[PDB]
């Protein structure tokens, strides 16, 4: 088997991240992948929000999760993602 908690869990976050990453990196608010919009807007929901984590709006949280636990593995300091190149400040 590949991943059994989730090839579907992983691949689904992998996509979450890839979307997220894309959404981070993609700066076209009218990319129309509105689902790209969305993720992007999710990054962007997240960051225009501060209740993201502080309150408990976990889009951002599961996005920080998403992004950071992503970050944790994308060694990059420069282009797309929320806590990605901000968690990635070493």
């Amino acid at each position: 088997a590949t991943q059994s908690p989730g090839d579907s869990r992983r691949l689904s976050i992998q996509r979450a991240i890839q979307s997220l990453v894309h959404a981070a990196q993609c700066r076209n608010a009218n990319c129309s992948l509105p689902s790209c919009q969305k993720m992007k807007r999710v990054v962007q929901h997240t960051k225009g929000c501060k209740r993201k984590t502080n309150g408990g709006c976990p889009i951002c949280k599961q996005l920080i999760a998403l992004a950071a636990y992503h970050a944790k593995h994308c060694q990059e300091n420069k282009c797309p993602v929320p806590f990605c190149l901000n968690i990635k400040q070493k």
């Binding site: 979450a16 890839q18 949280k61 998403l66 992503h70």
Partner: peptide, 25 residues
């Protein structure tokens, strides 16, 4: 770039996945 990785890293994916692709038509 390493965008993909095991779900051991990441906590509950549940949200952003919907944001990645829910079905909005």
């Amino acid at each position: 770039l390493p965008s993909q990785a095991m779900d051991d890293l990441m906590l509950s994916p549940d949200d952003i996945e919907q944001w990645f692709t829910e079905d909005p038509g």
